[model samples]
Target chain A: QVQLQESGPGLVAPSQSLSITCTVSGFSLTGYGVNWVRQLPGKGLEWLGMIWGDGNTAYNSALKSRLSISKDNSKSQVFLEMDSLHTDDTARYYCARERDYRLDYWGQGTTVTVSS
Target chain B: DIVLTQSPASLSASVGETVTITCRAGGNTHNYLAWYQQKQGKSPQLLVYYTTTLAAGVPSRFSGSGSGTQYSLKINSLQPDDFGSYYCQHFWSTPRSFGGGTKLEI
Candidate 1:
């Protein structure tokens, strides 16, 4: 069975950066691409970016200037960093594995609140 | 970025009835579309990918079809658990935009 768990601070001051981690078990990090997605309160899902199996990364144009995704394959962990956070950045962030255009094996999600 | 427009913003259906949701893309998606189901208070779950391929453990009652600029998700003999929001996404282009979403009610 495959499992993904997201961990990060629940709160961050405005203009600061947000750092999150996605840990996976029962799967190899080098075997698939991991995508970063978020959902604002009462909003639909947003595709932030993805770190491919070969260590390459791609991001949504809206956030490309502020978002960064990386992975530590040896540790089976993927990381996400978004700078200059704001109130609108408050949302539940999730990481999911992509397969054949499908996003599967999603993490439980970590709620981050941008305030102050 | 391709814009995906989902129809009916919301719909109501009874258990055992059939329902369908449509997604239209602003550009050619090359069959790189996928469908997702999101229940209230929960993360989205993949139901169909590559236009019509069901994800692992997805029920056969849910199906996807179409290509290029049009795609749809159909549910047959809808179950109580099927009541939720549905979204269609395009993976063929960068930024991977998603439809506005269709809310299913029972």
Candidate 2:
């Protein structure tokens, strides 16, 4: 069985950096990649970035360089960080495990409110 | 960034009905598109990957197909749990993007 949990603040002041933690169990972070996906108000799901098993990273071009993903293998945790957040950044963020070009398991997601 | 366009933003169907959602990418996906299903306030679940391959444990009624930039997810004999939003994703490039999503209502 695979499970994922998300932990982070519910509200964030505009322009402040944000960090959300996703802890995993039933798998090894060193073998599977973790991804950051978000759903903004009135918008659908979007891929933010991912922290691959090898520790390499990739991100959305629309977000430029504002987003970063990191993980701690020993802790079985993955972290999503976004800087210079704006009101438009408010959304529910999710962490999912990658498998065969897909996200096999996902967390319920954490709501991040960027109150301007 | 590769843009994905989904059609029929929303649809209405009933159980035992056949439904299909389409996703068209701006670039050549080369059959790397995947499909997901999401319910209200729930995380999206993978249904199909690698274009036509069903994810492990997914029902056989949930099928994916297409090539190049066009892909579609077909749900046959839909069940009560199948009504929700469906999304398509591309894995061929960075800024891996998901379709705008197709909302299904029963």
Candidate 3:
């Protein structure tokens, strides 16, 4: 019954920053780690980064320069921020629970389009 | 980061037919591989983990095996609900990575 809901702006102008939030239910953010993944238009999924249950964070090296993953444990919410966005950054973002080396649950996803 | 490559990008299989998808890694993964199924308009779900263990509630028709940099997922009897995108991922290293994915179609 674990659920994750992601919310964010629908459109972000190129060169601007993009921020998204994933609110959790049925579990405590401090008790479970959350990993972020995104699917590009007409493309496959990409592992972005993750905020572990202990609060440690890890990022995909390809995106580490512009990506940051964090959480507000008390609020039960996880956050993803990216700087200097481009059209190529557009995708449907999802937050999933990483349990025992596997992504067990996932959020519905928030689509963000980097456009003028 | 390890790069995973999946073959047959797409496949057309009839119901009741058995099929398999392959995944190759750029380097040794030490059997830290996993498989997921993503249906249209839905988020991905875990099907296999640690190379061969099936996820909770996953049907027995799905199986995984291999080692080092090679692996494959086999479906004993394909069903209508089996059509979708299947991806292979590895947790053997930091900044985990996923394969391009195989599209299972009717």
Candidate 4:
């Protein structure tokens, strides 16, 4: 079975940058694209962006200005970076594998709190 | 960006009853829609993709139908495990977006 584990700093200050990592197992990163999604406490899920197997990236219009998605093929890991964080940016981030136009597997999620 | 709007932000259904959730898009999506179910404290799971095709391992009771700018997910004989937040997403265009989501209760 494929699995994704998200890891990141639990606390981030406003106006700073936050980076999250998604490490995968049971498959190679080169075979599938990794997508980043987040959900604020008690809110719906949001599609942040995706890092394609070919190294191409796409972002949600609302977060495009402050988000970047990249991956390390050798380590089977995907990364997400968002700058200028704020209280509203606090959420549980998740990484999922996109295969054949569907998100097949997902990470357990990493919670990030944007507060001093 | 295609905007997906789901109806009845929240609903209550009884076990064994059939339930339906609708998703309306801002523009034609040419059957590029998918339905996901998110349980409390868990990541969302793909139930239906490409309009009406059930994802692997998904129950047959869950079905999807619609075209252009409209779509829907239907659950036949709802079960205890079916209660959750359901969302519809469009992948036909860049900057993929999802519906506000429908909360199902039993």
DockQ leader: 2
In terms of lDDT, the poorest run of 10 residues in model 2 chain A is: A59-68
lDDT (Cα, 0-100) at A73 in candidate 2: 96
Worst 10 residues of 2 chain B by lDDT: B52-61
Docking class of 2: high
RMSD, one per candidate, in order: 1.2, 1.2, 0.8, 0.9
TM per prediction: 0.96, 0.96, 0.98, 0.98
Task: Report the lDDT tens digits of candidate 4 across residue range A43-94.
Answer: 8888899988899999999889999888899998899999999899999999
lDDT, model 4, position A57: 91
Fnat across every predicted model, in order: 0.65, 1.00, 0.86, 0.70
Over the stretch B7-86, how does candidate 2's per-residue lDDT look in tens digits? 98999999999988999999999998999999998899888889988877888889888999889999999999899999
Candidate 2 Cα deviation (angstroms), residue B101: 0.2
Tell me how candidate 3 scores on lDDT.
0.94
lDDT of 3 by residue, A1-116 (tens): 79999998999999999989999999988878899999999889999999999999999998999998889988999999999999999999999998888999999899999999
Instruction: List candidate 3 segments past 4 Å from native.
Output: none
Q: What lDDT score belongs to each candidate, Candidate 1 first?
A: 0.91, 0.91, 0.94, 0.91
lDDT of candidate 1 over B52-94, digit per residue (tens): 8998899999999998898989999999999999999899857
Per-prediction tally of clashes: 0, 0, 0, 0
Q: What DockQ results for candidate 3?
A: 0.90
What DockQ results do all the predictions give, each relative to the true complex? 0.76, 0.92, 0.90, 0.81
